[PDB]
Amino acid sequence: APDTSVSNKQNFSTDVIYQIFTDRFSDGNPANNPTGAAFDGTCTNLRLYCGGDWQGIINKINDGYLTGMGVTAIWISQPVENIYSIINYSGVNNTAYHGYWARDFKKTNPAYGTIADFQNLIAAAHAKNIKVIINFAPNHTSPASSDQPSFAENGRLYDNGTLLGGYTNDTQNLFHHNGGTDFSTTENGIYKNLYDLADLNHNNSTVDVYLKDAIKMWLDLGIDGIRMDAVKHMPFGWQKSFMAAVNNYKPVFTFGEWFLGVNEVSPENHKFANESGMSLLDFRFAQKVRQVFRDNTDNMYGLKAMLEGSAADYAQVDDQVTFIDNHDMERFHASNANRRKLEQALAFTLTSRGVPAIYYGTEQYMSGGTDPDNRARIPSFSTSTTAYQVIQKLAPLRKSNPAIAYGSTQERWINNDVLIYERKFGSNVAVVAVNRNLNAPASISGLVTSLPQGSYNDVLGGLLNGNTLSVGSGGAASNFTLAAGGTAVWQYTAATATPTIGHVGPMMAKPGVTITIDGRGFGSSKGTVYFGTTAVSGADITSWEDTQIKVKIPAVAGGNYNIKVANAAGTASNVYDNFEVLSGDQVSVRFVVNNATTALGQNVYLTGSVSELGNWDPAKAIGPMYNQVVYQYPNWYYDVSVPAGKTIEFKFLKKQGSTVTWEGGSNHTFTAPSSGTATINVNWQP
Template identity: 45%
Template structure:
């Protein structure tokens, strides 16, 4: 997401198998390949790159003829292009691969505005699109994009496209939000006869769901996804990028696209995964688990097929290791999210990004940075490293916020402690599935010390971090590690090297030194055990990939509830199946060979999805705290369960209420509107049910009067 005015706002692997003493032997050679599964990113380490600020691989495109005067080669004007491009990133892929990076999140490469705003700012960041069907000339060409994807894949690196369908560019300056399709004009905020944009004020209350979706974010021209032309345009643009083999999508400003139940965003994820399984993750900015929008964000992650950038966990990491707050905050966030999120390991976590001050601007201690990185790389979720973190890159001007959080990458040193730390922990993520698929359990905790355990099947990892300058004696600690003595996986890299001795699940007392980070692990392949079913929203006839361990080489059976799935491919760690015809909703997936695995939940839609605006007019009078909901006979509408119904609906024109919902396409659906009163009582519409046949393509609308 990008504000209008920027100032505002050798590979090692430790396999710890059981043996009593002595201390474990030195690490062995690690795997060097990554999974080809484009939907399961759980074992991966993502590296976020702002293309313009990484590396200039082709100086000839710095000041292209179609957009002259937006480039500053001196790198003094932070609001202009500085020369980084697709060619430059491609040239540095070996540097990233050697660090253990297995996924690359690139800023939007689409063509941005060709003019400066009235604040003399260019779209160097990529979030002010003018043409989603072209590559911005400052960063390269479609051939450059194809070369990046192809080269990244050859090095075992997946590519995530940053896609920003919420808006175009500033609506009252520069190009007034103009939108083109491969050069052909479509609409502008000040020239919009087909209503491609919402013409409403700027968001004032970010806790108001209606304002979040329909008002303007930072005065950017807000696209109307419910408009059939906009829907077709955006999904066509995604389809073009999919043809180039991208592996995932980061959905910018997902909070501002996200109706209850997923809305249009759910139809986008359905369209993407109809092509092939992909990983999708959305930006839902919030302060923490106490944020008023947190429940809606959790529901979005559980229903839309789009995971979240885990901002509550980012906030906790910055608070604990950047601002010196109690380590108990991390455990509190993870405990709450463990209850609320169906797929915690699919959410992505980082310590900073392009929209906030870098960690070292918050706290300049390298020790604190190393501690925060270690926890980020080992907690539940997919770790993201913001470009240059491994080089201690930061600029503290005005506190280091946007745009100063976006310096030019200057060093590519492979010997820094942070680079070596990331490399070691990336190897651990790929060698021990406890990090990718494991549960979380806090093992020892006070204000300074955070010790936790990850467990999957017979794989265990224990992580200990002391952010204090004072050593702590750790006693009375339990673990799932088998009996034996374990060498610190990180050695002395982060003030560690302490061995751990386990007897009958009890850890012998040990000293955790000042600023020490230590990791101990055990690994065993005993299965079958499912760690991932991806994507987490599919439909009958679509493909999903099941990852884990112990599946064996001889195909067995895969069940969705009581129904057998058709197996497309089978290996000891990954199975691809076709989703059977099952009832929509959550299904438990199970792999059976000589024995059966754990059950793993996945959500199955009724079929292809379409976005429909449902409106009920003249609803009965409501009081503050009363809300209207929509329900019907499919999982998408809650299966007539008021607790799972779509809502609350919006009422900008009371007593009319509406919502944009993702529903089965080309289906006759039955539905009703209900009022849930502040006291918990429920008022249903009278019979009969409303009926509506949803469109087979594009978007739709359905309006009725409340049935008294």
């Protein structure tokens, strides 16, 4: 099957996602509507259930609203059963309409539908070439008070109906009891509660095994991707072991939500996306887009800086999920704002690198402040809005032109208000011109592109005042006027003679697992696949065609490898780096080191005899470790994904910058569990 097929669960770069807040999209089955005080059929009280469900999504899939827009993927509110409590927060009733208050990860939220409804949704979507992503929030259960068990459902967690435990009398330690986070430090935000939500303890074997079993159930139901909620708030090492569980079973595109504020560029965020096994919602992209197109707090130079910086900071920038707003931000379109601002932000996002995700209702020009005002019921299903047509014209390009899906990004013209950028992949090219200045045209002369000589029509057909482009020899464009608020898209596609890799997924798994290599120019005859210097050919290459290769990871030592392919004739492709071969199945183990004193700025790290611990290379040591919440300095701790059942030797390090101080004595040793978790507690050896 081609890289663009709906069956490709490992690659969403050729897709356009539609963010569906289930309860607020379409009530297709009034019969499963919550009743009484938990419901408001008029959807005036945005904190109660309005009725939106999966039958409704099925209907909008079948009547062409989404397909007519060029939408090829959707993500939905967490599907698992939530508490049924109607909580009164300072005079106002609140319900789990948002799906974030889980009580049973192995059952569905009856308000959204039954398991059968979910199966029907998966089927209906796939029949229309639409992939389905589910929100999954393993960080917590629901609102709770240990001193007041009668409050809500006490954060109780059930396993397919069987009560496991609640926040009160939590002798099993299924949850954390360290108060609420103030977001002062990453560690603080991980081992303390978000709001009053019962924080799950992933170091508890029951919890660990339970959540991994739960996600497998959903994987078996046919989901095509996972949107991990609040990933900045769970142990990064545990999440890696989680992604390993997913990838070593049935790999599907996964990304997490890690909020970044305006002007916030986070190295931790980059590292998580680069090493966790999942990508992230591109807040850095979203926030800059809002600054430039919405709030006028930066110009095109800032937009360019964001594009160049992110392409360098993210190992797989093409896996980051882009957007201009979502369920937590104020809607991009302000009540009194010119609609062209939203339309340009949309065109920009749809033609930029990554995986575009449009928040439901954006195309209907919905406005609204922060939660819950940004979650109003979609006002209409009109295909006649300009925004709807913008998506309709550009969304399909991610499928037809690989430059948009996998291409590099290069600025070709720029000033305060204008940015003309080029996407390029193999012989494919796309040039996008945007003039955010709604009052002043711009004279574009000296524009040089990779477009072959000829005349190119604006793919938007002048919808956003774009124009035709005339390209001479050398790719030099003839002088033209870019209209005020003008947005144009010119593109070119052609066969690629040389094997070219545009995407690989998953990027982390153990030997034997099948990975998907997408691109162009692979040829129809099986060639060769390389993991580092190791060559794979023949039977282990399950299938091979021009745009997609399915190949089993060879049994090489755990580590980071460069992926490359060669066609049947032996012509080698470009290198797709940063592929992590795991040493085997993974388990999350907590390492605790006692009496490791340090100077301010100096931190303790973990190193060991397996790639998962960096194979003794300090530059790849695990950490910086923590020393405040669960354990206190001079004791440090960290949760780490390590190969199950392996006997591992390790040591701790104290690092100040790249300067390293090693534990003295012999290596520490332990054997990781075959499943579940474990805690290894040792003393720092001088």
